[PDB]
Amino acid sequence: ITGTSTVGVGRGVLGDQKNINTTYSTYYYLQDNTRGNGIFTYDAKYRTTLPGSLWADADNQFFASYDAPAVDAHYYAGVTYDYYKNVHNRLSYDGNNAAIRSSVHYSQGYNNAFWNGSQMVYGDGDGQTFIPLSGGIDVVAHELTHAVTDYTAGLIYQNESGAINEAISDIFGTLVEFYANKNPDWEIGEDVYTPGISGDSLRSMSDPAKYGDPDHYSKRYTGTQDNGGVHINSGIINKAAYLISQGGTHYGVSVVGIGRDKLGKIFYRALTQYLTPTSNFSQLRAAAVQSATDLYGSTSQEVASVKQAFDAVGVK
Numbered sequence: 001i002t003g004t005s006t007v008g009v010g011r012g013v014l015g016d017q018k019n020i021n022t023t024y025s026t027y028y029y030l031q032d033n034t035r036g037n038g039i040f041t042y043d044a045k046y047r048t049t050l051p052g053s054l055w056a057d058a059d060n061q062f063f064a065s066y067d068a069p070a071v072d073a074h075y076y077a078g079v080t081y082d083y084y085k086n087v088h089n090r091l092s093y094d095g096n097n098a099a100i101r102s103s104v105h106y107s108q109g110y111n112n113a114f115w116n117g118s119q120m121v122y123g124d125g126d127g128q129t130f131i132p133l134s135g136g137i138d139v140v141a142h143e144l145t146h147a148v149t150d151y152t153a154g155l156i157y158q159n160e161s162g163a164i165n166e167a168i169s170d171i172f173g174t175l176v177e178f179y180a181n182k183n184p185d186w187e188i189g190e191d192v193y194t195p196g197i198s199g200d201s202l203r204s205m206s207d208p209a210k211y212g213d214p215d216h217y218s219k220r221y222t223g224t225q226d227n228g229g230v231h232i233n234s235g236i237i238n239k240a241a242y243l244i245s246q247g248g249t250h251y252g253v254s255v256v257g258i259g260r261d262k263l264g265k266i267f268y269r270a271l272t273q274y275l276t277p278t279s280n281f282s283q284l285r286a287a288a289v290q291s292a293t294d295l296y297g298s299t300s301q302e303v304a305s306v307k308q309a310f311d312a313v314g315v316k
Ligand SMILES: CC[C@H](C)[C@H](N)C(=O)N[C@@H](CCCC[NH3+])C(=O)O
Pocket: 111, 112, 113, 114, 133, 138, 139, 142, 143, 188, 189, 202, 231
């Protein structure tokens, strides 16, 4: 909508107060004009028609229970935009400041969040399995990273290419969570999963097998569920990424960690310069090797650690 840029205040899903960028034109809308062509947050009103209505508020204060998922979707889309721009010099998901659109209050009791090819979509959860999913910075950043991937490598969402697609979303979802630097970890979705259970998450990058996912190629899933295991086999790549950053010894193979910033540089370059729609895990190793060679040199520690990490998870 055309209007003037304003700054509202509200509370997110976990009860934290934050300032949000809004636009005033009769109402105050969740439209942030400070980032690219805008960040826009919509109310799906418990239905499944998308995007729904651009979020309108009479007083620029967003402290109602019903407001909290919107506050966080909007705010965390901003953080994710800032990460890509400031860390990777990328302007929005398409690299040309595309508008970022999100809908909250999708359906009733909906225990998921997704990128639909055009926008973000967040359920409220059923209150037991999940609370509203935009409360998780890693979740927001995971979903927006699918838009990045779709515009860049274009990894097909099935089988090994799909597991790479998922891992890239977990990797950058986690790196955004560290960038924001509130309560960061190498777990996925802990802040919105199972409010009645402390210390769990959907997936772990540090130990995928904690939640039943493979941590070595020899344990890969080859059945048909989950688009050929895209959220299962992502554990193999997530473990490799974790080892590259943090180091460790895994199945007897020792990796020297090179830290999060270099992990991010290597995988961002692989995603944007080397991966293709049909890349498999072997091809990802090659892309990450080439990317680290570009950035650091063929005889670098960084290249060595990339190779050691893929070796550790059985990917040649
Ligand atoms: C990043 C987390 C986000 C919810 C994502 N769409 C996801 O990982 N979903 C998988 C895990 C289950 C989520 C709730 N049932 C999924 O399999 O869809």
